[PDB]
Amino acid sequence: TDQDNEIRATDLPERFQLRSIPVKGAEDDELEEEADWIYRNAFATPTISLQESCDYLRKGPSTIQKIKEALGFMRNQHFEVPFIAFYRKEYVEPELHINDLWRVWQWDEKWTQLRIRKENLTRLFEKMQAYQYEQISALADGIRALDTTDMERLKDVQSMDELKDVYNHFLLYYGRDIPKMQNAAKLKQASRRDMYTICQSAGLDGLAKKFGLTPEQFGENLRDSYQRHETEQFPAEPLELAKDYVCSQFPTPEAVLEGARYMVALQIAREPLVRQVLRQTFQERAKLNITPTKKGRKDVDEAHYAYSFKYLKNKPVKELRDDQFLKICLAEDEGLLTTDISIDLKGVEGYGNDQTYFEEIKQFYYRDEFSHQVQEWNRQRTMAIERALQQFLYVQMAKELKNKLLAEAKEYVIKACSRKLYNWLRVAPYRPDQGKGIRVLGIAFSSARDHPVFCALVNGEGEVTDFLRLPHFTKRRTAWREEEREKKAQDIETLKKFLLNKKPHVVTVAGENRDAQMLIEDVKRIVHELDQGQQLSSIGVELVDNELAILYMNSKKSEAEFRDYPPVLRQAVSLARRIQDPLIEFAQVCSSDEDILCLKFHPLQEHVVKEELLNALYCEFINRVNEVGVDVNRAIAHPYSQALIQYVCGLGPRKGTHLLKILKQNNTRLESRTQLVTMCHMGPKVFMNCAGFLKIDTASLGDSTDSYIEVLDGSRVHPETYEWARKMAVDALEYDNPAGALEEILENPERLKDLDLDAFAEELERQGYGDKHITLYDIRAELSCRYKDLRTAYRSPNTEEIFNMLTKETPETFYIGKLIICNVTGIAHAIGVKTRLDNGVTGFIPTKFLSDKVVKRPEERVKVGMTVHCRIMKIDIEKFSADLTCRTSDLMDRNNEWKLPKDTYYDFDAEAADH
């Protein structure tokens, strides 16, 4: 497309150009209002529901300045979040870490969006104000003049909710005149009347105004919780006053009051101050009620996700936890439940009715006089507020609050996905218990015991150097056929010879199912036979999760890369590559076709906003890829690593492709960072963003390339700071040659530990560079070990990780108390019955738990190969075994001793009444 060439040419980060709303520069007044607005809404405001502190890496009012700096760098200087988080951290720490900088970046889109609507809505209010001034200068009882307080409300708007209130209020009073204004400015009116426009066409304004308080004054009595405004009293009864407005549309005084009460009720419901006060109150007081439908009472069984909450009575929305409200909306969308949000406690009590919100607020419009004239006006005021709360506000506030509780619950699920992806990308390359990498033998198999095991040997660069098929390695040494033992002995010798010849540093076995334990026990023994012969150095034997390798094997890429290879052997290569570098491997399966979503991040991940989840996951790549740094020469030499270049800060997929395209066209390595400007024609702002994160292996270069090699290019020192890094090395040696000094310091890094950096921070501050304390401590740490891998060192999976990885279960899907289906495999001697679950756990039913009644011989109840329903009592994660029961008293759980814990607000009285 034309856009791709404009993106390649333009000196801005690709993700700044691909952002929905274009990034525009900001004046210091806009940045200060935005910094305060982002601080209130994104950092100070607590969630309505109980959310875990998901900051896995309230922030105080000092954060407002740190946000003002961060927005200045993003909007005016065009730095992405990683460049700020790694190369401007002195201006944003300690309050903002890299995820908070992404949170600021995401909320700047929301601020810009709000300011755009608030400006266009101001253009509408100014045109309407001008149109009224023209009609007035050319007054009837229905003319409300749009004044400076109406404008000051709009300029004071702090959210899209408050904006929608100010717009709905404007439409109520002026929506009828909008088409007239636009035709006067130089199209036909969309027509429909809610009863309010009928009441205005009947001229009820002269009666609606006579109820006493104007809508704002009632708003102020609500806001302040006392009568700040006294109710103005008309000197007649309402039913007598109504006679003056009788016509064909309102034939009776009772109908004229019903029309005028409607017209007042809508004015109360669309007053911005009343909505603001009520919304504020509704978020404090709202109670969630849930009842199951005729479908729900049958379908929400013990195992269903909606079980713990199918009947809720009076649960405060402040007490919903984590994702619970998303599970409630899913169960409602499936038609299983009906949800109801009320500001009142629901119940049949007389005190229950007295305690309602309506009995509190009626007091803010009543006139406290006992005369029958005032008694009857207070009855009309009562019915106007009752209609304003019940028909408009309680409906509209329940829908607004439902959307907020659902957005908080979806955002928890998105944060839970990103927290899981972070935990996968943070694992370092395996280092045996290094500069030429590790040779890895990945071993893969299918769950079907007759399919062949495949092994693939990958060199430290990520190239497949050799491969092996073992058709009988799945057999057990205790097999009843000696032929199986013999055929496996040939494959064991074949693997033993392959290990002896190829000498890999680690063997990885697929976490496919429990037979991965059998492969690991055999592979560990074969490696121990080489150790007993003292033929070879220690080889690692690792269980590696195969979920990523399955997504690779099924990808278009795994065929395009190796068309000739069987699919199980393609999952053997990804199991070797994952332990060499998890980040380079995870970048392979994450294509422009959005293949990433096939990974099981969270049980609800398909029910959150797709575009928001993809941003939240690609931000976990961008965080780690820029911390780890990308070797461009490894990308050019080995096509396998080319996927990381798009996640480098500033680059993205179009500029990333273009960088490799020029270096391929020139047929040159990237020899020094200056070549990004001098060969690749990269603009200064894109160079600024990426230059610190691109690695160049200066030790790999030689011959005529020796003419220009900056030794710092292999490190996180940014090119803007090379002068200070050279000065720091020259001064650490006290030399009376900067390149020689730097080489001498890089060979002898211990000499730096005496150097007082704070005096140099004062000198750079004095030279006008500002505070550089954190930068100088980082340059000193960087010269002490160039590109030290900041990832968490590899560890073998623990007992809980192995169990979850091989059963494909979690503590939530395989819990004590669960009901399950199993096949009987045998009888233990009788001590109990052996079974196998579908997930591969070997279940055991001790003989006393086989029935409610004493069974002496299990053969009276069960046969080998029989399928049986059972209930879990205890789990042994180390042994892959569970203590099951099938006593009918436990199966139906007649005492309710095993069933999942219900919510605290579960309505046992409705449950008992429906039974």
């Binding site: 000065k727 001064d731 150097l755 007082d756 005096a759 140099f760 000198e763």
Partner: peptide
């Protein structure tokens, strides 16, 4: 002209 001090203990 400037020099960073090795003054730290």
């Amino acid at each position: 002209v400037y020099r960073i001090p090795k003054k730290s203990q």
